[PDB]
Design a protein around this ligand. Structure first.
Ligand SMILES: CCCCCCCCCCCCCCCCCC(=O)OC[C@H](COP(=O)([O-])OCC[N+](C)(C)C)OC(=O)CCCCCCCCCCCCCCCCC
Ligand SMILES: [Zn+2]
Length: 427
């Protein structure tokens, strides 16, 4: 375990071998995902005719509208993905990150250098990706009539989100770096608990303060829908406070619905794109019954317990690997071993195989968690209304019913429409 790690090679290097290992993995994962992308792109180009099983789900006009849309999305997804994978590789090989660290110079001094390094890194991040983002909304989402955004709204929102990002990023990072540099030798427990507080605080704050800045939040008007939601909320013993209708129709024709809170103060959030055109009151309640299922089946609580179990395991292995000067020298840091750089190298590159496996396992769990929430909706009796809703929402978001099994197994957090509909038909 430790005696085998001290062995030296008279044929191969040490720091250079682990750096290449990072890039070799990053490219094999990319090539695996590109193979999967190619596999699913073939499905869109081959299946031009509507299947007999998916015949009642979408008509030939809606199916070809969905086919064209998913095809344009696949083409963009490749080139935008290829540019990113090339950029990451090139910045690493060219030695961007250490040189940027030198340029953000000239414990308080290191935290300041880290803070300005972060500010510049996210500035380049935002600007380099903005043309791709502008293309997706104004060419893909606009061609297939989803986008409702103007160039002004897109621009004003980009700055709004970028500013709010820094105002959260800068204080959290400066306080996080402080705990690692000051604390010890068990600094990882104090750093993990800080991120634990920051995570749960941002979860409750987001929809109540951060989210109403970018999108128009208004309380749901009193009616047949507003009354029936409260009846369902009291039935499941869900402590409902308020019901909101988000102006999602200002951005895109895409529908959404979720809940948020801490304990006795829970609130339901609906999109106007889901209520208007959208879904009928009977279908909306069934969609809510599914989302309320995640609350009742404790999917919400289980997902937090997994996320904090992952960060504990990560901060522990970080505390074990932060002392190793070999991983810093690998990426071009020879003169110093900075804390923020250590967080970047270990969490985003050394943990890359673990992070990829954990993500796959959580995607498998998410699919199982969705089926359980669909089974809960059937247990409420709204199985027939959810069956109709899932199809109507799929037609609204031009979702292709056919999908490559290997692609959906790896990527899809939600199981395929035909798989979800068959489970509801059986119930
Ligand atoms: C309003 C803002 C509310 C903020 C609430 C913060 C709660 C923090 C709890 C810290 C507990 C520390 C324990 C040591 C290894 C142990 C890992 C434990 C991970 C689970 C922690 C509890 C999760 C509670 C979920 C609550 C759902 C409701
Ligand atoms: Zn769900």
């Amino acid at each position: 375990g430790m005696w085998a790690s001290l062995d030296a090679l008279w044929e191969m290097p040490a720091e250079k071998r682990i750096f290449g290992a990072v890039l070799l993995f990053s490219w094999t994962v990319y090539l695996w995902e590109t193979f999967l992308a190619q596999r699913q792109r073939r499905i869109y180009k081959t299946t031009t005719h509507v299947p007999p099983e998916l015949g009642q789900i979408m008509d030939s006009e809606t199916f070809e509208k969905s086919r064209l849309y998913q095809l344009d999305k696949s083409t963009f997804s490749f080139w935008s993905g290829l540019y990113s994978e090339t950029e990451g590789t090139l910045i690493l090989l060219f030695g961007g990150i250490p040189y940027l660290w030198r340029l953000s110079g000239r414990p308080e001094y290191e935290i300041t250098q880290s803070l300005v390094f972060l500010l510049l890194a996210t500035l380049f991040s935002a600007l380099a990706g903005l043309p791709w983002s502008l293309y997706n909304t104004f060419v893909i989402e606009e061609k297939h009539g989803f986008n409702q955004q103007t160039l002004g709204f897109f621009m004003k929102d980009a700055i709004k989100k970028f500013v709010v990002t820094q105002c959260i990023l800068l204080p959290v990072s400066s306080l996080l770096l402080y705990i690692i540099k000051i604390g010890g030798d068990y600094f990882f427990i104090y750093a993990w608990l800080f991120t634990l507080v920051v995570s749960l605080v941002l979860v409750t704050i987001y929809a109540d303060y951060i989210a109403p800045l970018f999108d128009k939040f208004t309380p749901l008007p009193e009616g047949k829908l507003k009354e029936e939601i409260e009846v369902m909320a009291k039935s499941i013993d869900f402590p409902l406070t308020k019901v909101y209708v988000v102006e999602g129709s200002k951005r895109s024709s895409h529908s959404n619905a979720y809940f948020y809170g801490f304990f006795k103060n829970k609130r339901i959030v609906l999109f106007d794109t889901l209520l208007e055109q959208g879904c009928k009151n009977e279908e909306v309640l069934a969609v809510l019954g599914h989302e309320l299922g995640h609350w009742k089946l404790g999917h919400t609580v289980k997902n937090i317990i997994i996320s904090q179990m992952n960060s504990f395991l990560c901060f522990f292995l970080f505390a074990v690997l932060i002392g190793r000067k070999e991983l810093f020298a690998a990426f071009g840091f020879y003169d110093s071993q900075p804390t923020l750089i250590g967080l970047l190298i270990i969490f985003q590159f050394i943990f890359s195989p673990y992070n990829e496996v954990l993500s796959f396992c959580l995607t498998v769990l998410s699919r199982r968690f969705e089926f359980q929430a669909d089974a809960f909706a059937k247990k409420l009796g709204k199985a027939k209304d959810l069956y109709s809703a899932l199809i109507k929402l799929n037609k609204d978001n031009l979702g292709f019913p056919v999908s490559d099994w290997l692609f959906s197994m790896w990527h899809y957090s939600h199981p395929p429409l035909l798989e979800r509909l068959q489970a509801l038909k059986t119930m």
